[PDB]
Design a protein around this ligand. Structure first.
Ligand SMILES: Nc1ncnc2c1ncn2[C@@H]1O[C@H](CSCC[C@H](N)C(=O)O)[C@@H](O)[C@H]1O
Ligand SMILES: Nc1ncnc2c1ncn2[C@@H]1O[C@H](CSCC[C@H](N)C(=O)O)[C@@H](O)[C@H]1O
Ligand SMILES: [K+]
Ligand SMILES: [K+]
Ligand SMILES: [K+]
Ligand code: NA
Ligand code: NA
Ligand code: NA
Ligand code: NA
Lengths: 352, 352
């Protein structure tokens, strides 16, 4: 026969499944709280607010207060918001992790939330089964869901292009402080730096501010340079990194190589290696290093980004051994990793 | 000025946000594992299986083993699956909560996973902001997303109707054992019972099996009775519960009243009250009781179902005080709650 349960049906176990099943409700209630701007209304107010006070300051009128109350109840249970009785009224405040929903500082995560929880950008995740049972198609889930590869898609959907670029801009804002402070020594002796696939320029604008004697260049596809603010002292160049990388003292690539498979990464890395000087040239790779032996705060989300790449770009997240092999195969002399308390780490690859 | 951070940026805190942001990845990787049938392949095998062995038994060929490996890595990190080295090979097994992904027992949750993580059925959650900032429309998010109210939608989409009905069938299978065993005394002295909105009949088929002397009736809308198997000894009746409830010794309503607002619930409850005898008649309500004072294993998912109802049906989940007021207002004498270690509880409402 088969297992016969006779006692003791375990509730915690079943609740864990329900919680995974409804994982999307956490993503999409969070999206709503962001769109309603609840955290900033409260933070600007400076004290907990009643339901009525909150309603008066929402993005539009009128407001369904029953719905607002129910969403706030869910948000309090997430431990993002608080509810308490103060001078005989129920008032809503912020819990410590809501600080990342508050505008006006480098760790505000709003742009990234709005990109990642976008309905069209979530669609490829519905094609995960088809990424394993391919039926002879080599297209990405992104292409299956949205018509074509991610980069050509952005070239043909300017609003999507801008939403994605601002998500990556936000991701970059999260790490720049640690980067320029903890890793200042990496920028010593550099006169020129090109941020390859540098997006709408958050990384170069920050490096250029911190290191006023380095001539900075941002390089990306035309449709991304087109969605970028004008430049004065920073060179803005458009092109295809598979065909050309602008020569400089250093090259940086943040969230680039995780987009591409091994053979492509080797082609990109070889191109960067030949763009930097034999005498102190370096390539600064900023991407996730997956630890598959121990658990860290960002482990869960790094494994998520592995599948995110599998579905959206055709890339992957890499363990240290995997990075080592890639850098070896591109013909570099060695590498050095620097952790910066972020999702991504810094990997310097030294061609000589 | 504003807060200036000077030290100590907290990683756990930021990871909690990332994990909420990517909550949907848990839902949609789980969906993929269900579609690939990984848990049942392994359970039927009876021991952990290598990646190669697994691939040979998947629903279709060929198989992208790199993708399969990466999805399994995520699934192991969820603690649904296991990975270990056995006789010099990496082999994949089941962790304890994967038992709910294994077919052939009443607590298999597969049908519910496939309904809840359906792409169309997830769509209304993208309209949560519009449920608070209504802009003068009284439509549900379900209607905004999919065109019309949930029940008419099912009447016009037979495949969706069948997927939803089987999700509710699964939900019912999860509780029937506890129901008929823990609550047998509720069925004493009953000669007839009508399951109002009884779906495709899982509840009545189970009650009819456990209590062979009770004449059971399932009652639902025509498009649901049409998606139901034929009946012999169980009456199958179609209609509109707002206009008619078949008279019987007892009426049961599982996952009904949570679909409707207060005024509608009162109209439904009054109709049931007048359908049962003055002498020992009872109405058996099976729905969530929300505890808003303490935390339980299913609290998180119950709050999720509150929003689920808000978005999909126009209903809500209710606290005991809320159930008390509703039952009082429908003119019942009293109520009694019985917990059955499930998402829903049992609430008997006694009209006299
Ligand atoms: N062939 C190519 N040449 C140059 N840039 C490219 C490219 N293919 C993709 N990219 C760019 O690579 C970037 C990946 S997203 C990373 C953006 C930025 N470095 C950041 O971390 O915030 C996108 O901006 C995309 O337009
Ligand atoms: N006016 C009406 N009359 C009868 N049934 C209705 C109805 N409006 C909705 N329903 C039904 O109410 C059910 C809600 S879902 C609950 C199904 C079942 N009792 C279960 O718990 O598994 C659906 O089957 C839906 O078709
Ligand atoms: K979705
Ligand atoms: K567009
Ligand atoms: K259909
Ligand atoms: Na309130
Ligand atoms: Na890690
Ligand atoms: Na393996
Ligand atoms: Na509860």
């Amino acid at each position: 026969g088969a297992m016969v349960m006779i006692n003791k049906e375990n509730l915690s176990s079943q609740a864990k499944l329900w919680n995974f099943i409804y994982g999307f409700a956490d993503s999409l209630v969070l999206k709503s709280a962001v769109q309603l701007d609840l955290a900033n209304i409260i933070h600007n107010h400076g004290s907990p607010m009643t339901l009525s006070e909150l309603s008066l300051h929402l993005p539009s009128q009128p407001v369904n207060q029953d719905a607002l109350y129910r969403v706030l109840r869910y948000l309090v249970h997430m431990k993002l918001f608080t509810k308490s009785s103060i001078d005989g009224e129920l008032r809503y405040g912020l819990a410590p992790p809501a600080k990342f929903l508050v505008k006006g500082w480098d760790k505000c995560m709003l742009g990234a939330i709005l990109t990642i929880t976008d309905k069209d950008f979530m669609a490829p995740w519905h094609y995960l089964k088809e990424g394993i049972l391919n039926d002879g198609s080599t297209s990405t889930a992104f292409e299956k869901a949205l018509g074509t590869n991610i980069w050509d898609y952005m070239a043909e959907h300017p609003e999507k292009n801008q939403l994605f670029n601002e998500g990556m801009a936000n991701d970059t804002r999260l790490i720049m402080s640690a980067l320029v402070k903890e890793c200042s020594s990496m920028f010593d002796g550099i006169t020129t730096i090109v941020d390859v696939g540098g997006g709408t320029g958050t990384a170069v604008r920050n490096i250029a501010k911190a290191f006023p004697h380095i001539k900075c260049t941002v390089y990306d596809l035309p449709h991304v340079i087109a969605d970028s603010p004008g430049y004065t002292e920073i060179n803005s160049i458009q092109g295809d990194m598979f065909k050309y990388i602008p020569n400089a003292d250093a090259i940086m690539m943040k969230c680039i190589l995780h987009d591409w498979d091994d053979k492509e990464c080797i082609e990109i890395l070889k191109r960067c290696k030949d763009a930097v000087p034999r005498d102190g040239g370096k390539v600064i790779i900023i991407d996730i290093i997956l630890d598959v032996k121990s658990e860290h705060p960002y482990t869960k989300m790094r494994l998520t980004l592995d599948l995110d790449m599998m579905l959206n770009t055709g890339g992957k997240e890499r363990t240290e051994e995997e990075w080592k092999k890639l850098i070896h195969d591109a013909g570099y002399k060695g590498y050095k990793i620097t952790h910066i308390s972020a999702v991504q780490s810094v990997i310097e690859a030294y061609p000589y």
